[PDB]
Design a binder for these strands. Structure first.
Lengths: 98, 91
DNA sequence: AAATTTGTTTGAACTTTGAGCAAATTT
DNA sequence: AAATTTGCTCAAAGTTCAAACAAATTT
């Protein structure tokens, strides 16, 4: 057959391990790391917009990368992400990618 | 100046931060590399799923389970948070 | 000159929100 | 015993959507 590829390992980054060998951990794990790192560096300072902070840090490069792929075609890009053409264009405005 | 970041090692064994947005690119760069014009259909709800999950995973761990502190921390409604927790089944 | 995409608008379908309250749980 | 948090449900506020369709651009 084909071999399973869990959604965990659909999107993946390159890491180095204890034996200095290149392996591919999930993006999940990068996100986890970053948050662990963000809390530790926080020091009892108040936070109240973590969702939008993360979302910004993820939408931008998804958009960046997807528009490169469709050589700048929105209809394709929006179809490709699964979102209305108008909201893509709204998101794009928000980060100044138009 | 950039708050969301991850650690990296160079060949000369030095650790060093880089923004998470640089990871997300790589992932996508890689996702697209390994497709070969196979249609992609629902990519926004995919990455979102791969980012919501460990964000919820970590903020509950941080707020010791406190749904209320968690929502307030994330800047979303207390009900939205319940719904997202059903979505990935983290009851 | 043919097809396809942009840039808009419209209204309907859906989602998030703030508040309210009893009942359960933590302090 | 007091304070806070859960689990719910209403409504209003806000976003996403598909569909139009000229006007611009690309095949």
């Amino acid at each position: 057959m084909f071999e399973q590829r869990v959604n965990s390992d659909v999107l993946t980054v390159s890491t180095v391990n204890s034996q200095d060998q290149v392996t591919q951990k999930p993006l999940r794990d990068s996100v986890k790391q970053a948050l662990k790192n963000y809390f530790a560096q926080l020091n009892g300072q108040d936070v109240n917009d973590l969702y939008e902070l993360v979302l910004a840090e993820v939408e931008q490069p998804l958009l960046d990368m997807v528009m490169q792929y469709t050589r700048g075609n929105q209809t394709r890009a929006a179809l490709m992400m699964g979102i209305n053409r108008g909201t893509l264009r709204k998101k794009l405005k928000k980060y100044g990618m138009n």
